[PDB]
Amino acid sequence: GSLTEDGLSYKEKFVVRSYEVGSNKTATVETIANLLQEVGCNHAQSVGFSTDGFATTTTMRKLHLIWVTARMHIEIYKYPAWGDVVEIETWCQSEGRIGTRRDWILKDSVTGEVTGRATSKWVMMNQDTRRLQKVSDDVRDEYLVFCPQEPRLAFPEENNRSLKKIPKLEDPAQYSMIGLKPRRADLDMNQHVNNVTYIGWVLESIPQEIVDTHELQVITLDYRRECQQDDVVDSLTTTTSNDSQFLHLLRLSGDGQEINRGTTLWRKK
Amino acid sequence: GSLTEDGLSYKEKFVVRSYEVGSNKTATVETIANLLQEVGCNHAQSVGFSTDGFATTTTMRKLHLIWVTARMHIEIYKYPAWGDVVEIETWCQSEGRIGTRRDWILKDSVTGEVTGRATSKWVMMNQDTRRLQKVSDDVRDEYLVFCPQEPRLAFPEENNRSLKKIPKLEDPAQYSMIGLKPRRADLDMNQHVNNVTYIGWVLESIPQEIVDTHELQVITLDYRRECQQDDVVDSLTTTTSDSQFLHLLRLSGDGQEINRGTTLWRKK
Ligand SMILES: Cc1cc(C)nc(N)c1
Ligand SMILES: Cc1cc(C)nc(N)c1
Numbered sequence A: 001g002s003l004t005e006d007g008l009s010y011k012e013k014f015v016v017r018s019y020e021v022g023s024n025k026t027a028t029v030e031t032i033a034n035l036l037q038e039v040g041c042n043h044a045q046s047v048g049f050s051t052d053g054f055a056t057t058t059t060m061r062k063l064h065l066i067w068v069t070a071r072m073h074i075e076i077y078k079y080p081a082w083g084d085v086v087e088i089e090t091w092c093q094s095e096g097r098i099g100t101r102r103d104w105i106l107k108d109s110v111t112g113e114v115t116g117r118a119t120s121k122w123v124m125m126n127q128d129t130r131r132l133q134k135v136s137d138d139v140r141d142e143y144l145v146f147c148p149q150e151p152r153l154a155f156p157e158e159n160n161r162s163l164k165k166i167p168k169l170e171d172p173a174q175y176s177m178i179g180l181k182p183r184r185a186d187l188d189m190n191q192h193v194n195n196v197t198y199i200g201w202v203l204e205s206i207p208q209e210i211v212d213t214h215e216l217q218v219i220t221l222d223y224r225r226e227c228q229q230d231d232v233v234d235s236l237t238t239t240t241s242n243d244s245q246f247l248h249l250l251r252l253s254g255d256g257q258e259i260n261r262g263t264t265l266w267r268k269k
Numbered sequence B: 001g002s003l004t005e006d007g008l009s010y011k012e013k014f015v016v017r018s019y020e021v022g023s024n025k026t027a028t029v030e031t032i033a034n035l036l037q038e039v040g041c042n043h044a045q046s047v048g049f050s051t052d053g054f055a056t057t058t059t060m061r062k063l064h065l066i067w068v069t070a071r072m073h074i075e076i077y078k079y080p081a082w083g084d085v086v087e088i089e090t091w092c093q094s095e096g097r098i099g100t101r102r103d104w105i106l107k108d109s110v111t112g113e114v115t116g117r118a119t120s121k122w123v124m125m126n127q128d129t130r131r132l133q134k135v136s137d138d139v140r141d142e143y144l145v146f147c148p149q150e151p152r153l154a155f156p157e158e159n160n161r162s163l164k165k166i167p168k169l170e171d172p173a174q175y176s177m178i179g180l181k182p183r184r185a186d187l188d189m190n191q192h193v194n195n196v197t198y199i200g201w202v203l204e205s206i207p208q209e210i211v212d213t214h215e216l217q218v219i220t221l222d223y224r225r226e227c228q229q230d231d232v233v234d235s236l237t238t239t240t241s242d243s244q245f246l247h248l249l250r251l252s253g254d255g256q257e258i259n260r261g262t263t264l265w266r267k268k
Helices: A029-046 A058-062 A137-146 A195-203 A208-213 B031-044 B058-062 B137-146 B197-205 B208-213
Strands: A010-015 A065-077 A084-093 A099-108 A114-126 A175-180 A214-223 A233-239 A243-252 A258-268 B008-017 B065-076 B087-093 B099-108 B114-126 B175-180 B214-223 B233-239 B243-251 B257-267
Touching: A010 A029, A029 A065, A029 A084, A029 A099, A029 A114, A029 A195, A029 B208, A058 A065, A058 A137, A065 A099, A065 A195, A084 A137, A099 B197, A175 B008, A195 A214, A195 A233, A195 A243, A195 A258, A208 A214, A214 A243, A233 B058, B008 B031, B031 B065, B031 B087, B031 B114, B058 B065, B065 B099, B065 B197, B087 B137, B197 B214, B197 B233, B197 B243, B208 B214
Parallel strands: none
Antiparallel strands: A010 A084, A065 A114, A065 A214, A084 A099, A099 A114, A175 A233, A214 A258, A233 A243, A243 A258, B008 B087, B065 B114, B065 B214, B087 B099, B099 B114, B175 B233, B214 B257, B233 B243, B243 B257
16 A cells, blocks of 8 residues: 555555455455555554554644544445455545544446445544543644645535434334444454444344345444443344435443444345 | 465465554454465465355365364464564365365565464365265365375474364353354355354453463364354353463353363463
8 A cells, every 4th residue: 555646645455355245245344444444544654643553643642632433434336346456545634623534435446436435524532531622723733744735525415425414213223133242353452442343233233134135335323432342232223214224323231321323225236 | 365386385465454453463363363264265266166155176066065164273473563464375185084174374474484373174064964974085186186295284293282182161160251142244255153253252251361461372273063143152261271271162042062172371
């Protein structure tokens, strides 16, 4: 992988592995989300971020600040097959004092066709108190160094799906998968649950018949609170809809505290 | 990746990913086991095996046969760090009518030093009845095409750890993690639980204090029965000692054994 000629974005190619694919011999959406995180991490290393797993700037380290994910939104047109090469381009943008955004475009390396796109929103937090805060002038100045100054959006459309508000699922849920818990493979190098694990847990409550007859086209996931290593999670889903749409909720098994909410859109094969 | 000049082994290089590492910023043993399976799959594709997820020969397809893992044994001297390149070389061998073996050597691509080695034993099974069987002459002939005919072993030594018999853990276990269940990410393309998931489940009952103060040097895992997508597993561990443990995975309900194993850990 490498920064592009202008140094404002980063590209990397991945060969899809045997264990990364599902029943149709194409990459799962969790494999896609892991590749998006990996290229994001390689881009951060290439522009001087800390190499301790927290991806912080110099000002952030001085002030004990970290970024936390607020939303992930992925749209896939074609999942790459086992052995195929996918090229992913990523870049960041500051959104004033609100937070920052990381965007991605996925392409078939042989054809050059766009096969998917993604966007994520991040908010600043004090690492010690876990309290949110606005982005300071010093941090916005650091982002100006390696971000395009004119807007560059993976989702340019007017009132596009990636910014839509998600409602809270009402009990009783139509479907559920109870008692989910992370194992060590679900943790990152800093012993926090990996963001991709929550996508897997959301999908656990989709019936196997939908997975067998449909392809996932869009997933939008809000993150509200982290699941700790000793927490247990319930995954709830209700149909809201040739397309099938669902509303999702992840909450702690032991008090019902919400940790995530989301929606998925599926197309019949 | 590519077959070597003589066409009897296969080599592939991997760059260790951010999400593949643990707290010491080095690859976990589950990341190593996934890379061993990936290079094994690329080698099978390169020598003409099925591309449907079952890695079968032509004679195996005609007779509705598949290979099932009986044992995995891994010894790591150094885990590669995040961003490092590891080169893995793999090859297979027939073991008469008993079954087949796949062996691996891991190297640091920059230094060329051996950083680990692994070996696995596979037995033939009818895909429909799930009954074991011996390897036929036609299948042994197919393996002669792409396997070295003189013995080539990752663990050559007579009576070495990789062939040691593993006893059955006695109740009560010292440690346990109960109620483990696979999610879709734990399944392979044929909807069977991935072999690497069982290594993760074994390690779940090792106390976090051992993981924080020691490095895993050796893991030996016997596979006896498959965990199905709707099964629930309990992971049991007892210290037998370096720190050494005895492991058992069994179904949560009826207590049916699915795996047994041992691990050896060295203090950091
Ligand atoms: C958006 C958000 C807010 C808070 C308090 N915690 C998160 N993990 C994410
Ligand atoms: C060694 C072995 C034996 C049987 C009956 N099933 C397995 N999955 C593995």
